[PDB]
């Protein structure tokens, strides 16, 4: 229909004027009286081998010791990142994965891929009983990010534009977060564990909330798809990491951009973003085996982590900030410090 | 140590499981939904079918449950042996299969792999154009009305937009639905593709 879409674009121009009215100065206009970080040079410590195909995602444990990895062979391997042991190596049903997660209670393991099923493995239960506890069916389209907000509730992305919630005790999808137009690629739960922002393939992130189910805010300002977002650890901001080589730091309660992180030599796509412990270093994984850092207070780069030759598919820092594990398509995980 | 011996046993198990899947040949078939899939896989995630014929083991990946836009999950098949199209023969979906063939023959992830195309459902198609020709939705393009040249006209439409600056030959087979040599054609094709990469793997080509 013509009239409702005309009303929609009229109120969209109203939203654009309302966002015009507030933007007087960005972060790089008020940060101009601080000290810079300086060119850091952190090398690897544990070049960790054991994969034979390309890997896709990882997640640290809460105790900052146990690592997880998922790849295109049927492996759901849990490592110890202190002496490079392999604590578990789960053979799962579908060889194709897309994501994985480690529970905040350190007890369960979530995984999933384009088998349209997020599966929960009951880690360290009994005498070698590393088994699938539940499988979360009732979910059309491929899956891109499972994340625990508890030991009993998961929030999983979708191919059919949802960000649904799951109760593991009965397997039933309680709430569904519809409202996107493209498929949702990543999530990042808040430290409040009541809000979560999700990015998708229509250049728009959405800040949902767990209880009332309504999308409270939708952030635009990108061009291509948004691959992997990460939340800033106060509860007020998040980085985006889109496909047009532009990590953008957005905020809450003002809905506009805070900064953009791009210059002319950055060409390829971005597919993994995670902050530091305080947030001074935004760690961004690129597509030209050149996962770099970004000083996310002065909008300039401060070092690269060139130790691969393929797509750096995933990265993640610990809860105490003492490390960063970067996993790529060359079957390796380089743990930098 | 106990945990170190457990890690070494796990690494031995992973290396032993490496050789089982490092020997098979994996294939994918797009087919655009309605096709003659249900015969060539007979002979809602990833429907994996697994057959073998004369010391070659195959693992098809019939992905149909996913949505229409597929720019985000198509890079996980970069490393497949040969794409298997399943274009049905029903003129005026016919058009949506041709738009998918443009996309996979222009991107970096599939500009070195082969395409084993299949013109399908011939005995339906031979009677479907015996009375209603191809020269209604198009102009007078064929020039005649049989099943040989009009079957070859769909082949020259698909081969019109292939770049092929490397080893990217496109086999084709006007196949029926009661065929008995269909799996021999996919065996005879994939041995030729295996020879071309092994000739490339040794280097002399």
């Amino acid at each position, epitope marked *: 229909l013509d009239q409702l879409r005309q009303e929609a674009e009229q109120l*969209k121009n109203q939203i654009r004027d309302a966002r015009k009215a507030c933007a007087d100065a960005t972060l790089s206009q008020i940060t101009n009286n601080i000290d810079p970080v300086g060119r850091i040079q952190m090398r690897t410590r544990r070049t960790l081998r054991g994969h034979l195909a390309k890997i896709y995602a990882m997640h640290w444990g809460t105790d900052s010791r146990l690592l997880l990895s998922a790849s295109q062979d049927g492996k759901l391997i849990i490592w110890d990142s202190y002496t490079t042991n392999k604590v578990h190596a789960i053979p799962l049903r579908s060889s194709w994965v897309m994501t994985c997660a480690y529970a905040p209670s350190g007890n369960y393991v979530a995984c999933g891929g384009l088998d349209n099923i997020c599966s929960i493995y009951n880690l360290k239960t009994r005498e070698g009983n590393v088994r699938v506890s539940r499988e979360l069916a009732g979910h059309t389209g491929y899956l891109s990010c499972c994340r625990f907000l508890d030991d009993n509730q998961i929030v999983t992305s979708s191919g059919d534009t949802t960000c649904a919630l799951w109760d593991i005790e009965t397997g039933q999808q309680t709430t569904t977060f519809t409202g996107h*137009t*493209g498929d949702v690629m990543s999530l990042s739960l808040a430290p409040d564990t009541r809000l979560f922002v999700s990015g998708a*393939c*229509d*250049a728009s992130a959405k800040l949902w909330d767990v209880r009332e189910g309504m999308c409270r805010q939708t952030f*635009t300002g990108h*061009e*291509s*798809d948004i691959n992997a977002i990460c939340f800033f650890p106060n509860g007020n901001a998040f980085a985006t990491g889109s*496909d*047009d*080589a532009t990590c953008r730091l957005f905020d809450l309660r003002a809905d506009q951009e805070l900064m953009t992180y791009s210059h002319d030599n950055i*060409i*390829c*796509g971005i597919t993994s973003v995670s902050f530091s412990k305080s947030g001074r270093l935004l760690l961004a994984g690129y597509d030209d085996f050149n996962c770099n850092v970004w000083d996310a207070l002065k909008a300039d780069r401060a070092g690269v982590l060139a130790g691969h030759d393929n797509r750096v598919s995933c990265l993640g820092v610990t809860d105490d900030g003492m490390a960063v594990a970067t996993g790529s398509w060359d079957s390796f995980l380089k743990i930098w410090n | 140590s106990a945990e170190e011996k457990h890690s070494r046993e796990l690494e031995k198990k992973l290396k032993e499981d490496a050789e089982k899947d490092a020997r098979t040949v994996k294939l994918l078939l797009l087919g655009a939904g309605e096709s003659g899939k249900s015969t060539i896989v007979k002979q809602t995630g990833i429907i994996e079918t697994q057959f073998s014929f004369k010391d070659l083991n195959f693992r098809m990946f019939d992905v149909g449950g996913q949505r*229409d*836009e*597929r*720019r985000k999950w*198509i890079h996980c098949f970069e490393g497949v042996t040969a794409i298997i199209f399943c274009v049905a023969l029903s003129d*005026y*979906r016919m*058009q*949506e299969s*041709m*738009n998918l063939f*443009k*996309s996979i023959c*222009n*991107n*970096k992830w599939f500009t070195d792999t082969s395409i084993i195309l299949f013109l399908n459902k011939k005995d339906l198609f031979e009677e479907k154009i015996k009375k209603s020709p191809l020269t209604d*939705y*198009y*102009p007078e393009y064929a020039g005649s009305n049989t099943y040989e040249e009009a079957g070859n006209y769909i082949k020259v*439409q698909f081969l*019109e*937009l292939n770049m092929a600056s490397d080893v990217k030959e496109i086999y084709s087979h006007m196949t029926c639905a009661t065929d008995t040599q269909n799996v021999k054609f996919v065996f005879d094709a994939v041995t030729d593709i295996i020879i071309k990469e092994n000739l490339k793997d040794c280097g002399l080509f």
Partner: nanobody
Amino acid sequence: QVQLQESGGGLVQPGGSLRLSCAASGFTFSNYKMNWVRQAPGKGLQWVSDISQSGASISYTGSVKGRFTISRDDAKNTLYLQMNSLKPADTAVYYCARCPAPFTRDCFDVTSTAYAYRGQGTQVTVSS
């Protein structure tokens, strides 16, 4: 957002030329590969034109080889298609799509339904 508005579609007797254009607003219109897609009255979407970033690589579909022309005016931020000697088998609607990844020759889902990076297009009907 990514706005792709178009103009230049009406009724035309066959053989007569018709020039239509896409004004883009929302991104940098210098480093995205661009496509022109049509959709018949009833049939599915069909890709027509495949103009690259600079202007070197230019492709066409099967039914159109030597009757449509395409040009991106970078400074005016506009894509241009022109139909010279069109046939009455084109009573379509016309969208202009942008390929998703910049700096890349990939145009993978510019023809898909419910796609996010193409405008509502114009209507091209043909008389006789």
